């Protein structure tokens, strides 16, 4: 429904144009490679990758990072502001170490995803969009994540967890709290979206090179 996040920036002691931010030299090499990807005279096309790199280096996007990207790519700062406020993967506010996103679209909602949502609610003791006090987890409800067949599923810091049950999310959460990273992929041992007991496709070994090339080639 309603968003709840403001699209206007107000100066804050920890978020202001004087907030310290800069690029580490290897990030600068990555930036120059990204710029080299596009045709000359169209440098800006690199606003999204450079901004994403800044977010990955810092964890979130302060206004100072936005201005730094704008001055590096020589584009008006308002353009970077529009890019950052348009796309939803950019964090304009500090976010926890483990950013948990739970898909609640209709295909995922059909396979009992609200139960997993409330299980995370109970396990962490924080609301749908709040952050745990120790700055370790942040829960966010998102749209389709491209894993409809593996519903229900969650996405935590670029890793996909699929075919979850409530219990499974408690093991994921407490393993993350322990310190190690749980393995990405579907649960129940179904191995990336085949029928659980069907296996109705791709059983016979694939044919070799040039199995059916037509004449004249």
């Amino acid at each position: 429904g309603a968003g709840g996040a403001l699209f206007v920036h107000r100066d804050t002691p920890e978020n202001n144009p004087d907030t310290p931010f800069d690029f580490t030299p290897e990030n600068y090499k990555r930036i120059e490679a990204i710029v080299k990807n596009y045709p000359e005279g169209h440098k800006a096309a690199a606003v999204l990758p450079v901004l994403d790199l800044a977010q990955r280096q810092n964890g979130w996007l302060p206004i100072s990072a936005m201005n730094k990207v704008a001055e590096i790519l020589q584009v008006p700062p308002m353009r970077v502001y529009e890019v950052a406020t348009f796309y939803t993967m950019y964090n304009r506010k500090p976010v926890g170490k483990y950013h948990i996103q739970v898909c609640t679209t209709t295909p995922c909602m059909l396979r009992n995803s609200d139960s997993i949502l409330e299980a995370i609610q109970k396990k962490l003791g924080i609301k749908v969009g709040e952050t745990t006090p120790d700055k370790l987890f942040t829960l966010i409800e998102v749209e389709c994540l491209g894993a409809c067949v593996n519903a229900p599923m969650v996405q935590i810091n670029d890793n996909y967890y699929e075919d979850l049950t409530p219990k499974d999310i408690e093991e994921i959460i407490d393993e993350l709290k322990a310190g190690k990273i749980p393995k990405p992929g579907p649960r129940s041992g179904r191995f990336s979206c085949e029928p659980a007991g069907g296996l109705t496709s791709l059983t016979e070994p694939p044919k070799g090179p040039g199995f059916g090339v037509q004449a004249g080639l």
């Binding site: 080299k36 990955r56 990336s192």
Partner: protein, 42 residues
Amino acid sequence: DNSTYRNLQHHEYSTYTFLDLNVELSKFRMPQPSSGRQSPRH
């Protein structure tokens, strides 16, 4: 053959893998074309 899953390589991907691969492939590209000027605002 089939029973083994062969996509576990992504289980050890860092946060900088994509950009590092981009940097590595930067030396394999053609020289980019040029529109004539440094920027449309120029």
